[PDB]
Design a protein around this nucleic acid. Structure first.
Ligand SMILES: [Mg+2]
Ligand SMILES: [Mg+2]
Length: 56
RNA sequence: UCAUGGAGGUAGAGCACUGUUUGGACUAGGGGCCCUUCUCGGGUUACCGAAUUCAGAUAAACUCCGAAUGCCAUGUACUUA
């Protein structure tokens, strides 16, 4: 598993990034999510790594 | 989002066509000095010169090529509304 925290804002960020975030299950900043380590999920990571911190 | 399959001819690159073009080889032909002379045909001139050909450049309306992305979808994948 891995822990996904939303540290940057979505304001000024394109809707693809926003939708990736909402699909990860994130809302407000400094919000935490715990997910599996599927490559599907790692793709959402690698599309929004600039907004996110990942822990395992 | 991941995987998979696809249309598509952009960026770039390239010259395989089309145009634009540089240098060289080489020339139909035009101009002159003429030899002549029914100026017929030659000596021919680097004074030009269609084209042809070798190498090298160029292209929104050129393409032998050709991505990233984006798009169409499929899935049981994994989240989410
Ligand atoms: Mg170009
Ligand atoms: Mg073009």
């Amino acid at each position: 598993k891995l822990e996904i925290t939303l540290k940057r804002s979505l304001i000024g960020r394109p809707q693809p990034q926003r939708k990736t975030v909402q699909a990860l299950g994130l809302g407000k900043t400094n919000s935490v999510v715990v997910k599996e380590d599927n490559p599907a999920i790692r793709g959402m990571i690698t599309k929004v790594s600039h907004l996110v911190d990942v822990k395992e």
